[PDB]
DNA sequence: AGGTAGACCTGGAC
DNA sequence: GTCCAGGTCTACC
Protein backbone atom coordinates (compact mmCIF):
# COMPACT_ATOMS: atom_id res chain seq x y z
CA UNK A 1 0.00 0.00 0.00
CA UNK A 2 0.93 3.68 -0.40
CA UNK A 3 1.54 6.01 2.55
CA UNK A 4 -2.11 7.10 2.80
CA UNK A 5 -3.35 3.49 2.99
CA UNK A 6 -0.67 2.64 5.56
CA UNK A 7 -2.02 5.55 7.60
CA UNK A 8 -5.51 4.04 7.32
CA UNK A 9 -4.20 0.67 8.51
CA UNK A 10 -2.37 2.38 11.38
CA UNK A 11 -5.53 4.19 12.46
CA UNK A 12 -7.80 1.15 12.08
CA UNK A 13 -5.48 -1.46 13.61
CA UNK A 14 -4.55 0.47 16.76
CA UNK A 15 -7.81 0.07 18.74
CA UNK A 16 -7.95 -3.61 17.80
CA UNK A 17 -4.61 -4.31 19.52
CA UNK A 18 -3.87 -1.58 22.04
CA UNK A 19 -3.54 -2.85 25.62
CA UNK A 20 -3.22 -6.50 24.54
CA UNK A 21 -0.39 -8.64 25.94
CA UNK A 22 1.62 -11.04 23.79
CA UNK A 23 1.60 -14.63 24.98
CA UNK A 24 3.17 -16.33 21.94
CA UNK A 25 4.74 -15.55 18.57
CA UNK A 26 4.59 -18.09 15.78
CA UNK A 27 6.72 -17.70 12.69
CA UNK A 28 6.11 -19.73 9.53
CA UNK A 29 8.52 -17.86 7.26
CA UNK A 30 11.63 -16.76 9.22
CA UNK A 31 13.08 -14.72 6.33
CA UNK A 32 10.47 -12.03 7.01
CA UNK A 33 12.18 -11.38 10.36
CA UNK A 34 15.20 -9.18 9.59
CA UNK A 35 16.20 -8.18 13.14
CA UNK A 36 17.25 -9.91 15.32
CA UNK A 37 18.39 -12.14 12.46
CA UNK A 38 17.54 -15.25 14.51
CA UNK A 39 13.75 -15.50 14.40
CA UNK A 40 13.85 -17.44 17.69
CA UNK A 41 15.17 -14.35 19.50
CA UNK A 42 12.59 -12.18 17.77
CA UNK A 43 9.78 -14.42 19.05
CA UNK A 44 11.19 -14.82 22.58
CA UNK A 45 11.76 -11.12 23.27
CA UNK A 46 8.20 -10.12 22.34
CA UNK A 47 6.55 -12.58 24.77
CA UNK A 48 5.00 -10.78 27.72
CA UNK A 49 5.11 -7.31 26.18
CA UNK A 50 1.92 -5.27 25.88
CA UNK A 51 0.98 -3.21 22.82
CA UNK A 52 0.98 0.48 23.81
CA UNK A 53 0.78 2.24 20.48
CA UNK A 54 1.05 2.19 16.70
CA UNK A 55 2.75 4.87 14.65
CA UNK A 56 3.64 5.34 10.98
CA UNK A 57 6.91 6.47 9.39
CA UNK A 58 6.79 6.65 5.62
CA UNK A 59 5.32 3.31 4.59
CA UNK A 60 6.58 1.65 7.81
CA UNK A 61 4.30 0.76 10.68
CA UNK A 62 5.91 1.11 14.09
CA UNK A 63 4.20 -1.00 16.78
CA UNK A 64 5.16 0.32 20.20
CA UNK A 65 5.31 -2.26 22.98
CA UNK A 66 6.73 -2.04 26.52
CA UNK A 67 10.46 -2.13 25.87
CA UNK A 68 10.55 -2.77 22.11
CA UNK A 69 9.32 -1.31 18.84
CA UNK A 70 8.31 -3.62 15.97
CA UNK A 71 8.98 -1.97 12.59
CA UNK A 72 6.92 -3.58 9.85
CA UNK A 73 6.90 -2.95 6.09
CA UNK A 74 4.04 -4.55 4.12
CA UNK A 75 5.76 -4.05 0.74
CA UNK A 76 3.64 -5.43 -2.10
CA UNK A 77 0.75 -7.34 -0.54
CA UNK A 78 1.36 -7.68 3.20
CA UNK A 79 -1.77 -7.38 5.34
CA UNK A 80 -2.60 -7.51 9.05
CA UNK A 81 -5.83 -8.82 10.57
CA UNK A 82 -7.00 -9.42 14.12
CA UNK A 83 -8.99 -12.60 14.69
CA UNK A 84 -9.66 -15.45 17.13
CA UNK A 85 -7.07 -18.16 17.86
CA UNK A 86 -9.92 -20.66 17.51
CA UNK A 87 -10.40 -20.08 13.77
CA UNK A 88 -8.26 -21.60 11.00
CA UNK A 89 -5.56 -19.26 9.69
CA UNK A 90 -6.08 -17.87 6.20
CA UNK A 91 -3.69 -18.72 3.33
CA UNK A 92 -0.20 -17.22 3.28
CA UNK A 93 -0.09 -16.43 7.01
CA UNK A 94 3.61 -16.10 7.88
CA UNK A 95 3.70 -14.46 11.31
CA UNK A 96 1.15 -14.62 14.17
CA UNK A 97 1.24 -12.70 17.44
CA UNK A 98 -0.99 -14.45 19.99
CA UNK A 99 -2.49 -12.33 22.77
CA UNK A 100 -3.49 -13.44 26.27
CA UNK A 101 -7.16 -12.76 25.47
CA UNK A 102 -7.37 -15.47 22.80
CA UNK A 103 -7.11 -13.05 19.88
CA UNK A 104 -4.25 -12.86 17.38
CA UNK A 105 -2.56 -10.32 15.14
CA UNK A 106 -1.93 -12.19 11.88
CA UNK A 107 0.46 -11.15 9.15
CA UNK A 108 -0.31 -12.48 5.64
CA UNK A 109 1.85 -11.90 2.55
CA UNK A 110 1.52 -13.83 -0.73
CA UNK A 111 4.93 -12.74 -2.09
CA UNK A 112 6.65 -12.97 1.30
CA UNK A 113 8.27 -9.60 0.52
CA UNK A 114 7.41 -7.80 3.79
CA UNK A 115 9.93 -7.22 6.58
CA UNK A 116 9.95 -7.07 10.40
CA UNK A 117 12.64 -5.54 12.66
CA UNK A 118 12.47 -5.38 16.45
CA UNK A 119 14.67 -3.06 18.54
CA UNK A 120 14.49 -1.39 21.94
CA UNK A 121 12.25 1.65 21.39
CA UNK A 122 15.03 4.17 21.93
CA UNK A 123 17.11 2.56 19.17
CA UNK A 124 14.52 2.01 16.46
CA UNK A 125 14.87 5.44 14.89
CA UNK A 126 18.66 5.22 14.55
CA UNK A 127 18.83 1.66 13.15
CA UNK A 128 17.71 0.23 9.81
CA UNK A 129 15.28 0.56 8.23
CA UNK A 130 14.14 3.86 9.77
CA UNK A 131 17.65 5.32 9.98
CA UNK A 132 18.17 7.95 7.24
CA UNK A 133 14.46 8.04 6.34
CA UNK A 134 13.51 11.54 5.19
CA UNK A 135 10.92 13.88 6.79
CA UNK A 136 7.18 13.13 6.69
CA UNK A 137 5.77 14.87 3.58
CA UNK A 138 2.89 16.36 5.61
CA UNK A 139 5.26 17.74 8.25
CA UNK A 140 6.84 21.20 8.47
CA UNK A 141 10.18 19.37 8.36
CA UNK A 142 9.59 18.74 4.65
CA UNK A 143 9.97 22.22 3.16
CA UNK A 144 10.79 23.87 -0.17
CA UNK A 145 14.12 24.83 1.44
CA UNK A 146 14.95 21.20 2.16
CA UNK A 147 13.91 20.15 -1.33
CA UNK A 148 15.86 22.99 -2.99
CA UNK A 149 18.97 22.13 -0.99
CA UNK A 150 18.92 18.53 -2.25
CA UNK A 151 18.03 19.52 -5.83
CA UNK A 152 20.86 22.04 -6.25
CA UNK A 153 23.33 19.44 -4.98
CA UNK A 154 22.77 16.48 -7.32
CA UNK A 155 23.32 15.49 -10.95
CA UNK A 156 20.20 13.29 -10.87
CA UNK A 157 16.90 13.76 -12.67
CA UNK A 158 14.11 15.24 -10.57
CA UNK A 159 12.31 11.87 -10.54
CA UNK A 160 15.39 10.04 -9.24
CA UNK A 161 15.67 12.68 -6.53
CA UNK A 162 12.05 12.31 -5.43
CA UNK A 163 12.32 8.49 -5.26
CA UNK A 164 15.22 8.82 -2.80
CA UNK A 165 13.82 7.85 0.62
CA UNK A 166 16.29 10.18 2.42
CA UNK A 167 14.73 13.15 0.65
CA UNK A 168 11.18 12.62 1.91
CA UNK A 169 9.26 9.63 3.35
CA UNK A 170 6.69 7.55 1.49
CA UNK A 171 7.08 8.79 -2.08
CA UNK A 172 7.10 5.95 -4.60
CA UNK A 173 6.64 5.66 -8.35
CA UNK A 174 2.96 6.60 -8.41
CA UNK A 175 3.01 9.74 -6.28
CA UNK A 176 6.23 10.95 -7.87
CA UNK A 177 4.74 10.80 -11.41
CA UNK A 178 1.45 12.33 -10.22
CA UNK A 179 3.14 15.16 -8.29
CA UNK A 180 5.41 15.99 -11.21
CA UNK A 181 2.40 16.16 -13.50
CA UNK A 182 0.45 18.42 -11.15
CA UNK A 183 3.50 20.67 -10.82
CA UNK A 184 4.04 20.82 -14.61
CA UNK A 185 7.59 19.42 -14.47
CA UNK A 186 9.02 16.67 -16.71
CA UNK A 187 10.41 13.75 -14.64
CA UNK A 188 13.60 13.51 -16.68
CA UNK A 189 14.68 17.07 -16.02
CA UNK A 190 17.87 17.53 -13.97
CA UNK A 191 16.86 18.26 -10.37
CA UNK A 192 19.41 21.09 -10.42
CA UNK A 193 17.62 22.68 -13.40
CA UNK A 194 14.46 23.50 -11.44
CA UNK A 195 13.96 27.20 -10.75
CA UNK A 196 13.04 28.24 -7.20
CA UNK A 197 9.52 28.79 -8.55
CA UNK A 198 9.36 25.17 -9.73
CA UNK A 199 10.72 23.81 -6.47
CA UNK A 200 8.04 25.75 -4.61
CA UNK A 201 5.35 24.41 -6.94
CA UNK A 202 6.62 20.82 -6.74
CA UNK A 203 6.70 20.99 -2.94
CA UNK A 204 3.14 22.29 -2.92
CA UNK A 205 1.87 19.58 -5.26
CA UNK A 206 3.75 16.83 -3.44
CA UNK A 207 2.01 17.87 -0.21
CA UNK A 208 -1.43 18.13 -1.87
CA UNK A 209 -1.03 14.78 -3.60
CA UNK A 210 -0.41 12.73 -0.45
CA UNK A 211 -2.53 15.12 1.63
CA UNK A 212 -5.66 14.59 -0.47
CA UNK A 213 -5.16 10.83 -0.34
CA UNK A 214 -4.61 10.58 3.43
CA UNK A 215 -7.74 12.61 4.14
CA UNK A 216 -9.83 11.05 1.35
CA UNK A 217 -8.37 9.68 -9.69
CA UNK A 218 -4.97 9.50 -11.41
CA UNK A 219 -3.74 11.99 -14.03
CA UNK A 220 -0.84 10.09 -15.59
CA UNK A 221 0.17 6.92 -13.76
CA UNK A 222 -0.67 3.90 -15.91
CA UNK A 223 -2.66 6.06 -18.32
CA UNK A 224 -0.27 5.89 -21.29
CA UNK A 225 -2.15 6.14 -24.57
CA UNK A 226 -5.10 7.80 -22.85
CA UNK A 227 -5.87 11.52 -23.18
CA UNK A 228 -4.54 13.86 -20.51
CA UNK A 229 -7.35 14.98 -18.20
CA UNK A 230 -6.25 18.61 -18.41
CA UNK A 231 -5.25 19.12 -22.08
CA UNK A 232 -6.32 15.98 -23.95
CA UNK A 233 -2.79 15.18 -25.15
CA UNK A 234 -2.03 11.44 -25.05
CA UNK A 235 -0.16 10.41 -21.92
CA UNK A 236 3.25 8.90 -22.64
CA UNK A 237 5.45 6.37 -20.86
CA UNK A 238 9.24 6.04 -20.91
CA UNK A 239 12.10 4.94 -18.68
CA UNK A 240 13.53 7.47 -16.23
CA UNK A 241 15.71 6.48 -13.26
CA UNK A 242 15.33 2.95 -14.63
CA UNK A 243 11.61 3.08 -13.85
CA UNK A 244 8.40 3.12 -15.85
CA UNK A 245 7.59 6.82 -16.05
CA UNK A 246 4.28 8.44 -17.06
CA UNK A 247 3.82 12.05 -18.10
CA UNK A 248 2.00 14.54 -20.35
CA UNK A 249 4.42 16.08 -22.86
CA UNK A 250 2.27 19.23 -23.09
CA UNK A 251 1.42 20.00 -19.46
CA UNK A 252 4.90 19.14 -18.17
CA UNK A 253 8.01 21.10 -19.15
C1' DA B 1 33.76 7.14 0.83
C1' DG B 2 29.86 10.09 -0.47
C1' DG B 3 26.85 9.76 -3.81
C1' DT B 4 24.27 6.59 -7.00
C1' DA B 5 22.48 2.93 -9.32
C1' DG B 6 19.98 -0.78 -8.90
C1' DA B 7 19.64 -5.76 -6.61
C1' DC B 8 16.69 -8.45 -4.34
C1' DC B 9 12.22 -10.73 -1.05
C1' DT B 10 9.10 -14.89 -3.82
C1' DG B 11 4.59 -16.65 -5.78
C1' DG B 12 1.71 -16.21 -9.36
C1' DA B 13 0.98 -15.65 -14.03
C1' DC B 14 2.93 -16.45 -19.02
C1' DG C 1 11.49 -22.79 -17.42
C1' DT C 2 11.00 -17.09 -17.63
C1' DC C 3 9.40 -12.86 -16.31
C1' DC C 4 6.86 -9.53 -13.27
C1' DA C 5 6.08 -6.86 -9.21
C1' DG C 6 9.02 -2.33 -6.77
C1' DG C 7 10.75 0.05 -2.54
C1' DT C 8 14.67 0.73 -0.63
C1' DC C 9 19.05 -0.50 1.69
C1' DT C 10 23.00 -2.64 -0.40
C1' DA C 11 26.96 -2.19 -2.76
C1' DC C 12 29.59 -0.46 -6.27
C1' DC C 13 33.29 2.73 -7.05
ZN1 LIG D 1 -1.73 17.59 -20.44
**Cα–Cα distance, A180 to A232 (Å, whole number):** 17
Q: How far in angstroms lies nucleotide C7's C1' from the CA of residue A86?
A: 35
Which part of chain A is CATH 1.10.8.50?
133-253
**Nearest nucleotide (C1') to alpha carbon of A175:** C7
Domain A133-253 fold is Helicase, Ruva Protein; domain 3 (1.10.8)
Exposure pattern of A186-213 as b/e (b: 16+ CB <10 Å)?
Answer: bbbbebeebeeebbbbbbebbbebbeeb
Phi, psi for A35 (deg, rounded to 5): -155, 135
Rounded Cα–Cα distance for residues A48 and A50 (Å): 7
Question: b/e string for A121-146 if b means 16 or more Cβ within 10 A?
Answer: eeebeeeebbeebbbbbbeeebebeb
How far apart (Å, rounded) are the C-alpha atoms in residues A103 and A216?
Answer: 31
A172 C-beta less than 7 Å away from strand C: yes
Domain boundaries for CATH 3.20.190.10 within chain A: 1-132
Which of chain A's residues 2-31 bind strand B, using a 7 Å CB cutoff?
29, 31
- 3-state helix, strand, coil split of chain A in percent (to 5) is 30, 25, 45
Q: Which approach determined this entry? A: X-ray
**Could you confirm whether A59 is annotated as catalytic?**
yes
CB A157 within 8 A of CB A189: yes
Give, for A244, the enclosing helix (H) or strand (E).
Answer: strand A243-247
Q: How far apart are CA A53 and CA A17, in angstroms?
A: 9
Alpha helices of chain A — where are they, by DSSP H? 3-17, 39-46, 121-124, 144-151, 158-163, 173-183, 196-215
User: From CA A67, how far away is CA A78, in angstroms rounded?
Assistant: 25
The CA distance from A147 to A167, in Å, is 7
Enclosing H/E stretch for A96: strand A93-99
Q: Is the CB of A170 under 7 A from strand C?
A: yes
Q: What is the resolution of this structure in A?
A: 2.0
What fold does the segment set A1-132 form as a domain?
N-terminal domain of MutM-like DNA repair proteins (3.20.190)
Amino acid sequence: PELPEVETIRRTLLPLIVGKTIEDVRIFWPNIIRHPRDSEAFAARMIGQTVRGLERRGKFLKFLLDRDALISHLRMEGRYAVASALEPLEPHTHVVFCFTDGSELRYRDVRKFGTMHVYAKEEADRRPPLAELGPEPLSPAFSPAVLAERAVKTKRSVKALLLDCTVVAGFGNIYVDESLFRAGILPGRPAASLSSKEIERLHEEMVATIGEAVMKHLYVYGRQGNPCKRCGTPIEKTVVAGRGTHYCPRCQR
